[PDB]
Amino acid sequence: SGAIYVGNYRVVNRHLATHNDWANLVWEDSSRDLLVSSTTAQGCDTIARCDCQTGVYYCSSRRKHYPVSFSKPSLIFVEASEYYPARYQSHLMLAVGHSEPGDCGGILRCQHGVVGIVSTGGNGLVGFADVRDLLWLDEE
Ligand SMILES: [Zn+2]
Numbered sequence: 229s230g231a232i233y234v235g236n237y238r239v240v241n242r243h244l245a246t247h248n249d250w251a252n253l254v255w256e257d258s259s260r261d262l263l264v265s266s267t268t269a270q271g272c273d274t275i276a277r278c279d280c281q282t283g284v285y286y287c288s289s290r291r292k293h294y295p296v297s298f299s300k301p302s303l304i305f306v307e308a309s310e311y312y313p314a315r316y317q318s319h320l321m322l323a324v325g326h327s328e329p330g331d332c333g334g335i336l337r338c339q340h341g342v343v344g345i346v347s348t349g350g351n352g353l354v355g356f357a358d359v360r361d362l363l364w365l366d367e368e
Contacts (some may be wrong), residue, residue, distance in 0.1 A: 230286070230333025232342050233271025234365045237264050241332045241347055241357070243311040259318040261347045261357050264365070274341035276360050283343055285354065286334035287326055296323035298336070298343075301358035306348050319358045320348065327354035 232239035240249060242256055242263040249265040256263040281300065284293050298321040308314040310329045321336075327349025334346040336356045348355030359365065 229288070229330065230335065230345060232273050232275070232335065232345060232359065233267065234273045234275055234342075235271060235367075236267050236269075237271065237365055238267050239264050239345065239359055239362075239365070241345060244332060255362075257318075259316070260320075261312075261317060262319075262359070264362075273335075275362070275365050276338050276340035276343045277363070277366075278338060278340040278360060280338035280340065280343065283336050283338040285323070285325065285336040285346065285356065287346075287354070288331050288334055289328040290326055294325055296325050296336075296354070298323040298356060301361070304355070306355065307350055309348065309350065317348065317355070317357075319361065321356045321358055322348075322353050323356070324352060325354040326352075 245263040252265040254264040301319040304320045336343040344356040347357040
């Protein structure tokens, strides 16, 4: 589990979104595994605006933050998980590291701020849904 809080937005894995999220929907994209809902309180997070490929991510199934190198966001085939069938996921970054389903929502951060959240795992990789292209998260 986990979310990003920026402005009056809450960014969550689409597959973990709640009824309240869907009832206060700003934007969602199944192909990206992302959903954004509206918040009353202002968020603590800053979104990275950059093309970093190194950062640190939180792994709940290890209670640890790990430094990682990761690929640039792309359209990647993802094997079946507990929460999706095998499918193509867009805007996905991969790193070598540990990720189980409940690790979804852990933040990946670089020197510029939040890069994305954990969205995929298995076979010794961790996949992250990028948010750095969502420039509208920083305004309105
Ligand atoms: Zn960066």
